[PDB]
Amino acid sequence: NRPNRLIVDEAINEDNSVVSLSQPKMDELQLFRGDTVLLKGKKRREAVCIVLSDDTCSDEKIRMNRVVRNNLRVRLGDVISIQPCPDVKYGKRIHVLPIDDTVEGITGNLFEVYLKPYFLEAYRPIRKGDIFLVRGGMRAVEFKVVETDPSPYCIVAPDTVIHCEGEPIKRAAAEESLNEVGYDDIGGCRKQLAQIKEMVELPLRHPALFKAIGVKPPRGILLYGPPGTGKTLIARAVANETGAFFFLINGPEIMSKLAGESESNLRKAFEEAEKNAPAIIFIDELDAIAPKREKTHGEVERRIVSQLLTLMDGLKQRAHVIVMAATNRPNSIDPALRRFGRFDREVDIGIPDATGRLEILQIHTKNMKLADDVDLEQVANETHGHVGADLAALCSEAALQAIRKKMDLIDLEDETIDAEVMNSLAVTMDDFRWALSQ
Amino acid sequence: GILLYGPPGTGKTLIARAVANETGAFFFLINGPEIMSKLAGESESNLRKAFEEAEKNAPAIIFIDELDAIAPKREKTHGEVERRIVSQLLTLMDGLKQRAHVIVMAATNRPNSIDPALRRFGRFDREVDIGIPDATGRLEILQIHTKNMKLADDVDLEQVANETHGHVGADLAALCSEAALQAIRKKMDLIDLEDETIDAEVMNSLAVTMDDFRWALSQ
Amino acid sequence: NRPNRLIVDEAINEDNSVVSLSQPKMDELQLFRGDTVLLKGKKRREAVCIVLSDDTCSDEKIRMNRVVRNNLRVRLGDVISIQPCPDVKYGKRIHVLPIDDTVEGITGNLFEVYLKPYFLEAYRPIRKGDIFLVRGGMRAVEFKVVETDPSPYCIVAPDTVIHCEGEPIKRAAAEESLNEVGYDDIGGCRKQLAQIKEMVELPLRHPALFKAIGVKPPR
Amino acid sequence: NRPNRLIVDEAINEDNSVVSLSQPKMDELQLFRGDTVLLKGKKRREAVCIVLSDDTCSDEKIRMNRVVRNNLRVRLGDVISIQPCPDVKYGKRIHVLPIDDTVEGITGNLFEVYLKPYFLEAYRPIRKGDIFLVRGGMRAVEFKVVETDPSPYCIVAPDTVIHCEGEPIKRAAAEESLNEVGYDDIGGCRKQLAQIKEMVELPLRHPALFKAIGVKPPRGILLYGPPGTGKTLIARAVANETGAFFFLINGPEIMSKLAGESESNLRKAFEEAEKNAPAIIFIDELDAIAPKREKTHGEVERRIVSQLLTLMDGLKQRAHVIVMAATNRPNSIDPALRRFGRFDREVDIGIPDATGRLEILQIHTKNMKLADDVDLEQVANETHGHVGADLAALCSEAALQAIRKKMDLIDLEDETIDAEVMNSLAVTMDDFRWALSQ
Amino acid sequence: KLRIRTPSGEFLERRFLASNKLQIVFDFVASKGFPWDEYKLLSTFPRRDVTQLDPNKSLLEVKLFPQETLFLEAKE
Amino acid sequence: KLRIRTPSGEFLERRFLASNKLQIVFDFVASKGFPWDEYKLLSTFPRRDVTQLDPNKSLLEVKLFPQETLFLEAKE
Numbered sequence A, D: 001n002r003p004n005r006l007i008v009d010e011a012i013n014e015d016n017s018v019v020s021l022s023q024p025k026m027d028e029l030q031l032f033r034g035d036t037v038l039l040k041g042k043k044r045r046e047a048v049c050i051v052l053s054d055d056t057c058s059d060e061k062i063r064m065n066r067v068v069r070n071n072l073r074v075r076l077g078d079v080i081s082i083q084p085c086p087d088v089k090y091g092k093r094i095h096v097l098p099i100d101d102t103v104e105g106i107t108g109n110l111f112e113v114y115l116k117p118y119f120l121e122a123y124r125p126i127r128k129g130d131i132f133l134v135r136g137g138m139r140a141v142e143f144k145v146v147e148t149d150p151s152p153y154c155i156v157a158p159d160t161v162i163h164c165e166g167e168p169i170k171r172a173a174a175e176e177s178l179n180e181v182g183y184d185d186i187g188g189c190r191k192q193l194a195q196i197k198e199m200v201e202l203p204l205r206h207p208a209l210f211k212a213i214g215v216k217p218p219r220g221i222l223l224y225g226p227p228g229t230g231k232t233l234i235a236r237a238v239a240n241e242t243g244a245f246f247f248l249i250n251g252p253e254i255m256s257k258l259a260g261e262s263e264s265n266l267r268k269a270f271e272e273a274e275k276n277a278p279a280i281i282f283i284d285e286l287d288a289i290a291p292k293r294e295k296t297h298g299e300v301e302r303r304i305v306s307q308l309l310t311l312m313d314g315l316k317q318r319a320h321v322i323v324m325a326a327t328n329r330p331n332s333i334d335p336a337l338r339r340f341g342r343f344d345r346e347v348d349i350g351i352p353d354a355t356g357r358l359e360i361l362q363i364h365t366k367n368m369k370l371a372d373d374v375d376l377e378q379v380a381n382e383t384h385g386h387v388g389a390d391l392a393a394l395c396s397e398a399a400l401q402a403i404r405k406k407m408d409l410i411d412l413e414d415e416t417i418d419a420e421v422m423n424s425l426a427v428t429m430d431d432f433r434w435a436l437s438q
Numbered sequence B: 001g002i003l004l005y006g007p008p009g010t011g012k013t014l015i016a017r018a019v020a021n022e023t024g025a026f027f028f029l030i031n032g033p034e035i036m037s038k039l040a041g042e043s044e045s046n047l048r049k050a051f052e053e054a055e056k057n058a059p060a061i062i063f064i065d066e067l068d069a070i071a072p073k074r075e076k077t078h079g080e081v082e083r084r085i086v087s088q089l090l091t092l093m094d095g096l097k098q099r100a101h102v103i104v105m106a107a108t109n110r111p112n113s114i115d116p117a118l119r120r121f122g123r124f125d126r127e128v129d130i131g132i133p134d135a136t137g138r139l140e141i142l143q144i145h146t147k148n149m150k151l152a153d154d155v156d157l158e159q160v161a162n163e164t165h166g167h168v169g170a171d172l173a174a175l176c177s178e179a180a181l182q183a184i185r186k187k188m189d190l191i192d193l194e195d196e197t198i199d200a201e202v203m204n205s206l207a208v209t210m211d212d213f214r215w216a217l218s219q
Numbered sequence C: 001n002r003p004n005r006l007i008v009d010e011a012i013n014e015d016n017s018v019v020s021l022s023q024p025k026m027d028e029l030q031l032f033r034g035d036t037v038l039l040k041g042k043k044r045r046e047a048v049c050i051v052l053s054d055d056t057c058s059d060e061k062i063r064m065n066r067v068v069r070n071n072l073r074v075r076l077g078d079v080i081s082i083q084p085c086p087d088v089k090y091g092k093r094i095h096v097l098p099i100d101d102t103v104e105g106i107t108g109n110l111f112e113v114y115l116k117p118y119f120l121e122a123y124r125p126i127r128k129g130d131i132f133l134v135r136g137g138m139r140a141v142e143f144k145v146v147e148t149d150p151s152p153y154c155i156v157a158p159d160t161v162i163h164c165e166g167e168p169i170k171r172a173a174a175e176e177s178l179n180e181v182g183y184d185d186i187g188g189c190r191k192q193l194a195q196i197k198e199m200v201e202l203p204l205r206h207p208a209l210f211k212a213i214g215v216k217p218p219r
Numbered sequence E, F: 001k002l003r004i005r006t007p008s009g010e011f012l013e014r015r016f017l018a019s020n021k022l023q024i025v026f027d028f029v030a031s032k033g034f035p036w037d038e039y040k041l042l043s044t045f046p047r048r049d050v051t052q053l054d055p056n057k058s059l060l061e062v063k064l065f066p067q068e069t070l071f072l073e074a075k076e
């Protein structure tokens, strides 16, 4: 409508305090790099951020991280309003408190470990009632801004007093965990993720439309790839990002149950999804439930496959349920699953390139202090033929080595490390080397 | 008994339902998977029930979808409960009196899929091959599936028909859907103003363009 | 902290009365080959041993057999304190009794079979409340030192009277069987054992850490 | 020391008159965008060009197209000298003549078709004795600058008289065809091409080194990929770009010969290569000569495999011969070929991504007039699973359709088209569509 | 910083802030005997005619690179 | 065009050509009560301290964007 309205898009820069616009749009709106902007979203929520320019950003779109989106209570594809906020005063006193779930087990001075370096010389704009995320000591903590010096907005500047009262707040019902999986946790499947996004856009984000139109939305999406490529991740992310109910069916779980309990659980899954729609069902290890008729020895197994087919077929268009399933290759599974109504769409999540590996490594080192000696590009380059799971494990193994080495040196009075010492602990390239060498 | 043999998506279920509607006959659908999902006798009961119901509301067409699920060849039929079901079907078919005014239509991929007993004199004694369509047929199918759609002048359904080599009806139908949804998706971005999730009117104002088809064909 | 603190490591020499240090560390602590040392561990438990030098021993580590570890109530990877104990007096009378489980079926004079050759010209340092292990006659017997001449420590020297009262003692809850399997019972898998050790170190020996961190340990 | 010396690198911009430097280097040398520069190379050859700035260009390197390299008689990795040339005067009269090979069959006014739009408002610096390349009418013509107004250099400016006398010049021995295959003709195998480049650098470009050192250079490189991925291209390009003798062995050809004639031809190939070293031998369809011992029915076939092994083994390090061979998969060929001395290195040339497809399409439309309606990106996107050969053929088919359509309209007095009308003919998107639809 | 060449090939140098409208550049060329009517301002690599670009747009918006060589030709 | 913020958070605006040495910017901040010794000039997104960058380098070379917000903090 008005040019101040833009469409929420994914973020190139992962800094909580940054939003991105096309230079055209910035010019049009007379915005200068670094200008504090005020963003308005749903539930009359508001947020203040720093604007920068992204070449890739479409003129009608804004790029914001998931922190901002949550604060504005918007999802990807929603519309927001942007206005300048030049009245930003270096506020004197801010009061921030952590959310309980995020700080369980953490036993540090949250200020020194999290808050201090977050805000330090950042000149970060903050608003009351904002929840922000600080990563470190192999964790990520969510803090809510309980009070700010100027009541609406403030810039946390060097002399800004940051106060933590030290009583962890509860999580309100509308507040979503930033520890939930999102697209930002998935690296390397850009194009595939994009396809799936498009597929689920209308059915999940705009269900009503299907009452008005006779066009049939895609019902089943089959994610084929080797193990550890992030198929489960993708499904969960899509659910979270579209705000859809997620029901997990795990092949082994189903097959562990006796006789009808299998099929009951299957039906129940479908029914539950139908009820909490819009919904995504994810079938992990579909090959376990529904192999080819050749490999299907025994009648109980055939019954289960049959049930699944019927269940899929029984999904009405108005049910607003998408079923996503993961398997190794299409040749793994009974071809009936690929019929018109059933898994009619396939996406291939494959082994990533070095570029993708780098993104994956980045994702899995985000809560880690990495020494300057760490060359994730090197790691990316040498880790030929590795899938996400491999890389993730490599990062773990490196961390644990680091910890192991330090635990030996904590033979003095020092406790089992600590949140602080964990935050002081840097994973070094040698740690990665140990892992790669193992 | 009429046996409709063809690859998936050729419109076997369509044909049966159409014939029923056009002749004004009761239509009972038996779906292989559904039957086989049931436990033990519940399978065979449901089979009997289908036949009985049809007999009652005759003239009637029974359609067996995915007949290969109910009645594979004796080789592929591992286990006795499965053999019982095939047997039941044979008996049920045989038990159909001429006076019953019931035709049974069944769909499968190839005659070699199914137990040859089904092709005996009384049983599925007639076969029709519904095959992959020619370009001419593809065009008709595209036309059918764009009938409720506003198509821009740029749309060349003949082009689409020509380039969609080896596509069956289901493929074409899906292509049309995908094109529509793309169109909607594009417009939903522009409805960022004040308008709700489209509308009957805006849906009617929305034209699917050749680019929309192109996106679909390219996907 | 203080250099007297070291990390418990596996033992190259399986003699109950021997602990091993790097020569550097021995020099640093001014320790002479054969010097009796006093080791302090958890539950305020204590033990006295003979120190020797191992080339392979890392400077920050001590090598002790499983006997010692149990007496110090420490496990591999724990920290202990080492101080010299030059006040070791050839004690006159020690009283040792076997643990019941270890002597079931054994029908000898424990002295002649086990105790005598264990201590004989060994000049072994002993402390009260120590459990030691003597191997022979296709068995291994655990004896507890119930009383020593000088109350804390003693060196069992030739003229030392060794007395067994002949009532087998019960096993207290904190006391672990030396007939349990340990790394000392595994030969040939050095490198593989090392890998597994590392794998289980943090999850088994330091579980708490996993509350504070989001890294996933090997399952 | 001296900073005017730079290392010849591949070219991002394919304009004949452009060379690229890092801005740092341009600043260091006080160069302004568009400044005419004089480049000095081997055989005391010289060239004048326009300088621009490439981000990717390493400070110590210069990017120049193959036209320039040839004019400077340098190869990739050579060193050149750059000096400013501000004394360049808009020259009055230049005289250019085409090389015979390039113009065979061309029957146009070379001026209007090639020369005019090349120079038009380009303000191109030219030097006497330069050979430049103009692409059009599904051909590329090489012209030599025979005379220029100011004797050394000139800028061809609007009023510059361009004269073509119309006697095609012969090709001198040092002058290389720009119709020869080079890296610029290979799209999509960036990383693989880079590896091969490194492999052959020292043995082909610096053979002498192997007299001084005892390190063994790679002898055999095995290029594995599906058909049409450009394995033959790669080999020929590498040969051309390194200036090495290229001997082609084609499996079928060898196997067509009777008995010893096979093995003789094999030996001869090796001997010939040895003689004209540094050399690359390329074995096309190696699977024909050397299948696995299982599939090798008959003794004459086994003899040939054996011969090849011995021939490979018999290559002394000082021979300065690299053997490159192409096959579908390593499982195709006798495993003995992968021993230490033999094909000890494998590179996988795979199916290209859309990005690579676009490059390939660009390569194959370079001599073609494409209407504005042509969207090569579209073509690239929709041509999933296509290899280079597929794309190349698509471009041909589109061209020929275009020609076919026009040939109908040339039903008037006009002859079978012409160089001119061919140059006037544009391939349209519909032409591509026809091809894609076929 | 723009280096403009006369049709005789004489270099003319001037610096303008990117915020300056293209008209500022036009006036600069209009200072010498180069009217917008009688003369065109051409760009090479890329090839464009700045003359016909909107004068009100910023030098940044007319996509003129921090350094650009420009040429003058009579609109004849 | 650089917008520099005082430690009190007051915007100071000035335009310099990219060719201008960073020293020109230093002198501008040195105009107000902000000596190089007593005050630092910080950049955010990216995070850097321009104060310590070479004054002789061009504003383009010091990688200052055509628009950049900068901040002043006492070197304490």
Ligand SMILES: Nc1ncnc2c1ncn2[C@@H]1O[C@H](COP(=O)(O)OP(=O)(O)O)[C@@H](O)[C@H]1O
Pocket: A185, A186, A187, A188, A189, A226, A227, A228, A229, A230, A231, A232, A233, A234, A326, A360, A363, A387, A388, A389, A390, A392
């Ligand atoms: N593309 C990816 N980007 C980031 N992490 C990934 C990716 N693929 C896998 N992982 C990591 O591997 C873990 C296991 O992968 P998972 O989602 O189970 O995939 P799959 O379903 O193929 O086994 C994920 O939680 C994540 O840590």
Ligand SMILES: Nc1ncnc2c1ncn2[C@@H]1O[C@H](COP(=O)(O)OP(=O)(O)O)[C@@H](O)[C@H]1O
Pocket: A340, B007, B008, B009, B010, B011, B012, B013, B014, B015, B107, B141, B144, B168, B169, B170, B171, B173
């Ligand atoms: N010939 C056709 N004409 C129109 N639509 C068709 C045709 N063939 C297939 N379809 C479409 O594909 C869908 C799936 O085919 P269906 O009728 O179930 O037959 P089959 O049993 O061969 O899959 C049809 O409902 C219709 O949407």
Ligand SMILES: Nc1ncnc2c1ncn2[C@@H]1O[C@H](COP(=O)(O)OP(=O)(O)O)[C@@H](O)[C@H]1O
Pocket: C185, C186, C187, C188, C189
């Ligand atoms: N590496 C070893 N060191 C010591 N004893 C061993 C070793 N390997 C096997 N043994 C002996 O062999 C017996 C069988 O060992 P066990 O753990 O059952 O092996 P596995 O699980 O491989 O069958 C054990 O009683 C043990 O005495």
Ligand SMILES: Nc1ncnc2c1ncn2[C@@H]1O[C@H](COP(=O)(O)OP(=O)(O)O)[C@@H](O)[C@H]1O
Pocket: D185, D186, D187, D188, D189, D225, D226, D227, D228, D229, D230, D231, D232, D233, D234, D326, D360, D363, D387, D388, D389, D390, D392
């Ligand atoms: N990567 C590529 N870049 C450019 N052209 C290619 C590429 N791959 C294939 N081609 C085209 O296809 C033709 C056949 O390639 P060729 O070298 O014979 O491949 P292969 O050796 O795998 O059969 C080449 O002449 C070229 O035009």
